[PDB]
Amino acid sequence: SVRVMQLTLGNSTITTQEAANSVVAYGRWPEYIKDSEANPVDQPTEPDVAACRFYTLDTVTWRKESRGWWWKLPDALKDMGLFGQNMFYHYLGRAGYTVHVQCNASKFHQGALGVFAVPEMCLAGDSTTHMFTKYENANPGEKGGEFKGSFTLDTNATNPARNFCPVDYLFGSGVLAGNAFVYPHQIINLRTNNCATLVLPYVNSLSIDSMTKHNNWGIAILPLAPLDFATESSTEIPITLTIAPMCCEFNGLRNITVPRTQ
Amino acid sequence: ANNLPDTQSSGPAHSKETPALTAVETGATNPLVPSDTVQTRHVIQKRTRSESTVESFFARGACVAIIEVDNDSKLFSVWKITYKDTVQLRRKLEFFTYSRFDMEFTFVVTSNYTDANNGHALNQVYQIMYIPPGAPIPGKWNDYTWQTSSNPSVFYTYGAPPARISVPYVGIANAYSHFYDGFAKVPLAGQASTEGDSLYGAASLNDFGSLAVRVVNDHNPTKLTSKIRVYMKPKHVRVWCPRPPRAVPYYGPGVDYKDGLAPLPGKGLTTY
Ligand SMILES: COc1ccc(OCc2ccc(COc3c(Cl)cccc3Cl)cc2)c(Cl)c1
């Protein structure tokens, strides 16, 4: 039925008994580069089962006060097994994804989470200096980031944070959040479903790019209807994020990249 | 101006054929492609060399002269036709030894009052007369030579779109020579040193003649100056014998050099 599914990729399987169908972004399933759209001339590496499998990133907790969370792809998976290895050993890389967000509660809980997949999800910074966010802050990895309820300008001139300041109702980029529904999405309304499943093809203005310099997709999760339970002002339910890269192919092998951190 | 070949997929090799090894002493360049030294994938090539054709490389109007006339002998000026008065077009032409093409000349004319608060003049008309080598050159801005009964003239009205005319291949040889390793005279044994001496690399003393420019209106005591910028574009181009481009500053009409003889910067041998 629309509600029961099983996803198998490599050596990993995911089962769900409360789905609300699955979304295939823009109606496009991920695919490899065709010869007619090929650019780099060298033989690509395609790890296949070693990289195209389900990786579970860290679990976040939803509370009445949560504003939202965000992650960047392939960034969030840079340290994930052999996918991360191939990402750092190659100059160029390409991949699609199957994003599976998990969140179960009970029949006496309420709340709705909007799960959006955004191509080129550029976020707003914290200073008066334009495009000032530094690489280390823009790429948090598997832990991702969070949305805020208001904009707060960083004034420390001696030691600028050079970080993002994504305000939730402004979708972290100066647009109204209610219009974010034009992007592939699903809603995890506690009275209806457990999860959200989105299949994302590779989207870019090029056939292949640098995975370290460029993040193709952004995953934004916003509480559309806040978490509430029985009478417990105190309520916490975890949100686990499991993502699997698809049709990975890398070009331009050399020595490994070791990016600067923190 | 066409397509480039596709990249064919290439796998591993273990053979007695070694395209990587060669011997440049022969004077030939090794025609290798990526698949000769690495494993390649099949790529359908869609890039073309449409913009690097000899025609597209020269298909631009380049400035070759700025003729100036002061409508208050300066009432008229004469410019000896050449492409060596400027450096940009000259350097591009000199990638080749010989050339053959037609020419398109566009004239951009500007004028202005020298005085911010003095004088006035009615709209000016200019006459650009071509004086082929041999024809009488004007001595005054208004002598008989300006009747142009045979010389081609162009009358330009100030403010009108730039004037433009086409000239056929006018060389007396089968192609224009960008380089001429010789003289116009051979000094003979016995003659005075003053005799038989000529410039090295020069052909005719007057190759293509010159342009005589003047303002046709009667000059008013007002101080005015006009400038005619000449733009030339080679069209229907054919070129022969490539040469390395000019690396140091030009020093005259010849290949002479003097000043910027150290064009390259310093860089460590093992510095990326
Ligand atoms: C190798 O590169 C070359 C070769 C020959 C060249 O000049 C030959 C040449 C001969 C006659 C005329 C005369 O053209 C004109 C006429 Cl009819 C009427 C009005 C104005 C002009 Cl302008 C103009 C140029 C140049 Cl500029 C570059």
Swiss-Prot record, chain B:
Region described as Disordered: spans on this chain: 1-19, 27-46
The organism's place on the tree of life at top rank: Viruses
Localization (cell): Virion; Host cytoplasm
Biased composition (Polar residues): 1-12
Function statement: Forms an icosahedral capsid of pseudo T=3 symmetry with capsid proteins VP2 and VP3. The capsid is 300 Angstroms in diameter, composed of 60 copies of each capsid protein and enclosing the viral positive strand RNA genome. Capsid protein VP1 mainly forms the vertices of the capsid. Capsid protein VP1 interacts with host cell receptor PVR to provide virion attachment to target host cells.
Assembly: Interacts with capsid protein VP0, and capsid protein VP3 to form heterotrimeric protomers. Interacts with human PVR. Five protomers subsequently associate to form pentamers which serve as building blocks for the capsid. Interacts with capsid protein VP2, capsid protein VP3 and capsid protein VP4 following cleavage of capsid protein VP0.
Name this protein carries in UniProt: Capsid protein VP1
Complete-protein stretch covered: 602 to 879 of 2207
